[PDB]
């Protein structure tokens, strides 16, 4: 297990590191949900943890830990370990263990300041909000790690391409390749935003940073970063769920095309986060809008490919008429159950995002509690649930520890609660957003400030209780899996459960074209030079740096 696949170990450390992160970050959730239901439990939390000074220090850890530390680590686990196991190759271990220590040292470096109240700036850290230099230095190093993650997978692909000239990229690899490439293009904004401004700014080397340029450059990454969260799930959903589900991936090509399209349209769409900004041309915003409705196509595609697969998996295990196939599925199965539930809520999640996309409509919901509503369905439901369920096949595979009857049932427990709780919370937040309730606010410290929002508050609070149990149950579940001296090697070498693929004759021509990865990559690059170049050049001509503020 460890010594002809030590990748299993390096992979396992990305998980623990990540799951300890999701646990710590998550603690603040239940609180913030009640906070949105008009209850102040923060003296209660302040008495659990002496170091918390404000709602906002807590929302910062929560944003950062969960959405930045958890998700990247999961990404690293999945989008490196999966391709390696399909190809039956080892990554450069020297390089792989460098990526780990960089994600650990960046994490640590950043935390010290975060936990000391020197970076209460949210996971977006918009200037002139000026946090401690080690939080910028820490996050940068934390991100940069992913650059080794790109390289490593590119290497494995160079290696397999060579042993096999002419041959088509295997599916998971194909996916991991466009994924890491797309993520390299993404990360250019944030790195430039770090290298050119943030880092000098807090190092004392300049007294000021441009708010518009800073956010424009940040949103170059902060959109594709969410796809950088999703694909590792889509990867699993496409090539492993359908096995767990009792059937097959119905289309190899469609899954590549899906991901291709992500490589193309994930990065040039950032002014969707800036509809509400000055100094960016109305023409460009609409352009960025059309392209955003475009990046929604892959997922619309994904809905169909995936649905079919489950219908056929449920057909295979004797599923009946219009809906019969749904019952026939293995509902006893945490690995099956967790992302299928996530996928139900991904429906609404998406249908929100598209409202969000459509320029003029974004002035109804922008910075309300509706964006939270939205993204929780997305990253704290689907990505996280896919993550959660996946321990039930991935963790046995890493360590060789099997899952008992009860730990499974404890998991089923967690996932049905998490999902329901996430559903519920989405009603509240969406509802609250339409009633103009802003986000990122300590609203329970102004009790008579949203009196027309009485009801959705109930839901928030209710989701807060449910999801507190959800998380506690999970922490217990997780650690029982991790701290049992229960071990067998034979199922730890037992292969990952990859699905077989349905593949037609027409594939050939289509799949060969999508393999022209250098070309597709070049286009993606051009798409970003076209979509951001004009606007960036403008800004870089008329730079108005303003001093930093500390307001916590």
């Amino acid at each position: 297990v460890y010594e002809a696949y030590p990748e299993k170990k390096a992979t396992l450390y990305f998980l623990v590191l990540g799951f300890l992160a999701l646990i710590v970050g998550s603690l603040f959730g239940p609180f913030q949900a009640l906070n949105y239901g008009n209850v102040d439990a923060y003296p209660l939390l302040k008495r659990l943890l002496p170091f918390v000074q404000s709602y906002y220090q807590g929302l910062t850890l929560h944003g950062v830990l969960n959405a930045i530390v958890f998700t990247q680590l999961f990404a690293q686990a999945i989008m490196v370990y999966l391709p390696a196991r399909e190809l039956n190759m080892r990554p450069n271990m020297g390089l792989m263990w460098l990526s780990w220590w960089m994600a650990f040292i960046g994490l640590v470096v950043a935390a010290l300041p975060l936990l000391a109240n020197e970076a209460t700036v949210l996971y977006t850290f918009y200037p002139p909000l000026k946090g401690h230099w080690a939080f910028y230095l820490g996050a940068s190093v934390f991100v940069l790690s992913t650059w080794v993650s790109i390289y490593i997978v590119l290497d494995l692909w160079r290696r397999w391409k060579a042993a096999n000239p002419g041959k088509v990229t295997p599916l998971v690899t194909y996916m991991a390749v466009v994924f890491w490439l797309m993520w390299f293009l993404a990360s250019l904004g944030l790195v430039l935003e770090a290298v050119l401004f943030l880092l000098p700014w807090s190092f004392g080397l300049v007294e000021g940073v441009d708010p518009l340029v800073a956010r424009t450059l940040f949103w170059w990454t902060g959109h594709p970063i969410v796809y950088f969260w999703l694909l590792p799930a889509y990867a699993i959903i496409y090539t492993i769920l359908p096995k767990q589900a009792g059937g097959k991936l119905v289309s190899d090509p469609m899954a590549r095309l899906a991901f291709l399209l992500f490589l193309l349209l994930s990065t040039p769409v950032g002014f969707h986060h800036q509809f509400a900004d000055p100094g960016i041309d109305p023409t460009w915003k609409m352009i960025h809008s059309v392209l955003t409705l475009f990046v929604a196509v892959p997922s619309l595609m994904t809905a169909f490919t995936v649905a079919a697969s489950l219908e056929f998996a449920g057909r295979l295990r004797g599923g009946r008429g219009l809906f019969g196939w749904i019952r026939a599925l293995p509902w006893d199965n945490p690995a099956f159950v967790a992302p299928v539930l996530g996928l139900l809520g991904f429906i609404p999640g998406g249908a929100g995002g598209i409202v969000n996309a459509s320029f003029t409509l974004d002035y109804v919901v922008h910075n309300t509690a509706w964006v939270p509503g939205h993204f929780h369905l997305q990253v704290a439901s689907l990505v996280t649930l896919t993550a959660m369920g996946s321990l039930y096949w991935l963790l046995p595979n890493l360590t060789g520890k099997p899952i008992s009857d009860a730990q499974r049932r404890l998991g089923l427990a967690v996932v049905w609660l998490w999902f329901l709780g996430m559903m519920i919370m989405a009603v509240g937040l969406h509802w609250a957003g339409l009633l103009n309730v802003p986000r990122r606010a300590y609203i329970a410290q102004v009790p008579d400030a949203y009196p027309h929002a009485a009801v959705p508050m109930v839901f928030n609070v209710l989701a807060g209780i449910v999801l507190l149990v959800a998380l506690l149950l999970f922490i217990y579940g997780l650690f029982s899996v991790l701290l049992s001296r229960e071990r067998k090697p034979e199922l730890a070498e037992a292969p990952l459960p990859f699905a077989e693929v349905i593949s037609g004759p027409e594939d050939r021509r289509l799949v060969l074209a999508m393999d022209r990865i250098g070309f597709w990559f070049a286009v993606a690059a051009i798409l970003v030079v076209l979509a951001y170049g004009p606007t960036l050049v403008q800004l870089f001509g008329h730079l108005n740096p303003v001093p930093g503020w500390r307001l916590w």
């Binding site: 619309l300 809905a303 169909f304 649905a307 079919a308 489950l310 219908e311 056929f312 449920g314 057909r315 219009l322 809906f323 196939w325 749904i326 429906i347 609404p348 998406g350 249908a351 929100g352 598209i354 409202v355 459509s358 003029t360 409509l361 002035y363 109804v364 919901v365 339409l434």
Partner: protein
């Protein structure tokens, strides 16, 4: 065997849910106009 009526339901629940959300807001949009 035959036509993926299950998938065709799902893409139909998706389609119904996109419209509700979108038109639901477009309506609100003009109302706050």
């Amino acid at each position: 065997e035959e036509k993926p009526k299950g998938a065709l339901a799902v893409i139909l629940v998706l389609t119904l849910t996109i419209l509700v959300f979108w038109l639901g807001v477009y309506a609100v949009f003009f109302a706050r106009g």
